[PDB]
Amino acid sequence: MIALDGAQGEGGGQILRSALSLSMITGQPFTITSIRAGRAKPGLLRQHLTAVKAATEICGATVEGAELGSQRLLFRPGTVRGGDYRFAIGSAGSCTLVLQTVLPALWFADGPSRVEVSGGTDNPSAPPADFIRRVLEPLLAKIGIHQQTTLLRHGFYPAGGGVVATEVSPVASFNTLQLGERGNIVQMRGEVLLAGVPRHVAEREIATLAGSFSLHEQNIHNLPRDQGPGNTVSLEVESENITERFFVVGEKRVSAEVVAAQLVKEVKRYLASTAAVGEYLADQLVLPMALAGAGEFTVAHPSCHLLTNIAVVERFLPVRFSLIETDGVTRVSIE
Amino acid sequence: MIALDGAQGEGGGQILRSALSLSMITGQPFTITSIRAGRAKPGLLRQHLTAVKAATEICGATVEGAELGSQRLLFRPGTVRGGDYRFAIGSAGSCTLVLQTVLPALWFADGPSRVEVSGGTDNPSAPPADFIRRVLEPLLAKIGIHQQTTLLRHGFYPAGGGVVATEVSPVASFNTLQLGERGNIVQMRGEVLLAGVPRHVAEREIATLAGSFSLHEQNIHNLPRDQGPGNTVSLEVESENITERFFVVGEKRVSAEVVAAQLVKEVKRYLASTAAVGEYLADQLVLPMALAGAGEFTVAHPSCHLLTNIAVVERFLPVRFSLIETDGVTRVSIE
């Protein structure tokens, strides 16, 4: 039975979620031993417990250790049943992470499924639920996976209140995704999302983006105050071979110019290499291509997350990933 | 002015120290912004302060954030002055860390120096101060760097009271270190250090080593009780093209065979690949070879620390590292 070390790599968290999906995809039970060893909060936390309850439900699992402070977990899956699921995280809970725990398993469920989660849609430090729909959902569709995520209500950290819902269909046949050169840029678009925040913050954040980029469109998107106070700014880089979109969630004490300046940092950083995908989309492509048994993509630099995702994957599956950091770009490929 | 993110990679600590040495090597001031964001203890801690006080003494620096809970720091170094320094960390302080923050700078000092540090020499969780003298000092010498570390008194975690002192000499000219194949073993040697522990733990420990290895020498090293109760076991792997040494510090509630077995796991893990160097020595060679402007070495797998150390180095210096993960061995090279 598979044993994983929680302090390994970046140090738990992602290890738990990649394990869950894999352990269900595969059926191999596993045991994480030092969950969040050194993190401020030592082990399983409400979100992880929710990640775990959702997992131990989509697949009738048997778990040992699912307690709020646990640094040990034994998870024995069952059959990933398809169906209408509804999970509810708190406020600090990112629907994104529940969904990226459970959806992979559902790719192999006995039938189509719908997952609806509640909680935070946009968190300052983390990826927004939009990345799912506007960025990876398409690479996935290309790897033969079929998912459709709709953002139904936004929950801006620290408010909570968001509602995201994904429609899945058991993967029929897998395809090999072959990314490399980003290709020539086709168009860049900036977009700001205000909910309870004034139209002078959007304009300011937009401007900054227009400051270094030639946006084909500058869009300001207004959501009901109901959606609490929130501001999220994004720039999309629809290159030829790929379409990426970067985000930066405005913080409490962070200025329109600072928030926009973070995003500009990233965007330039991506653009500064020929690499088709960003560090984060890379982190997400590791699993699906593994299931697919082949495929590759280029990414500027191997990140510490990549490294651990590739570990867990290879810990549950008969795959070999190869990273060839040649000329400022890294070619991540399967075997 | 260089800005560094403290939650980046493994998550601060090493970023802080690699940033200091570089900042003084180079002169470029910088700013760490989230020192130990998620860790149990959120930012600058006594040890780090010491790292920072020692740094901001070797080079007459200007610091902003040097407070016991700080998650932010601004460091403006000056001229690295050579001379006889004496730093004193606590008990939980590892001389090794202070020494690896300061010593790189001192290779570039206006004159020869001596650095004496007090505190913990042998910590269960971390590398012993012996690793410096018996393992990296030689690779360094080959790089053209000239340093000599004598352990003068041991301080076993949690006691403290250890004393390590290093003599350095400004680097005249640098060399290219080209490592790769470990070559054939040339001899193994086990060693047990007892300070206030009985000569039955040493034997038991040695036995286990002799249990899977063919030790050319089985040395038991007895320290005055003065040195507190301590037990450290090590095994040296003198291969053709390199000599490595692995250590495991016997813990409070850890038995002779458990201690011995940890060491055997590692030694084997090492031995299981053609890679000249171990994860840790790899981490340490990043910087020197970068100052060297070329060089390489092979390591089994790229670690997360490797990733981040490479990051910081590349942030302060005009160097490109290349990782090529080919055949279970990764080749780290410079450009």
Tab-separated table of C-alpha atoms in Angstrom, chain A residues 4 11 31 33 50 54 64 93 121 126-127 130 141-142 171 173 177 188 201 226 234 239 242 247 298 320 332:
chain	number	residue	atom	x	y	z
A	4	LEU	CA	3.524	9.293	1.012
A	11	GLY	CA	5.409	20.279	2.169
A	31	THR	CA	-1.143	6.971	3.608
A	33	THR	CA	2.286	10.591	7.184
A	50	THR	CA	-13.765	19.013	3.158
A	54	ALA	CA	-15.928	15.105	-0.811
A	64	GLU	CA	-8.405	6.792	9.038
A	93	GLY	CA	-12.147	27.475	1.492
A	121	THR	CA	-14.047	31.893	-5.773
A	126	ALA	CA	-4.163	31.331	-4.975
A	127	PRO	CA	-5.760	30.775	-8.426
A	130	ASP	CA	-11.965	31.249	-13.654
A	141	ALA	CA	-10.879	19.086	-23.790
A	142	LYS	CA	-7.790	18.492	-26.029
A	171	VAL	CA	-13.280	10.203	-20.400
A	173	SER	CA	-10.450	8.117	-25.135
A	177	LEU	CA	-1.326	17.147	-25.950
A	188	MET	CA	-4.161	40.610	-25.166
A	201	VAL	CA	-10.073	51.223	-9.232
A	226	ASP	CA	-24.104	41.250	-2.999
A	234	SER	CA	-6.699	39.661	-15.328
A	239	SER	CA	-1.007	33.353	-28.394
A	242	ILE	CA	-2.195	28.542	-26.568
A	247	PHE	CA	-4.943	36.926	-12.504
A	298	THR	CA	7.245	23.645	-22.400
A	320	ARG	CA	8.078	8.625	-16.333
A	332	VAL	CA	8.185	18.309	-19.458
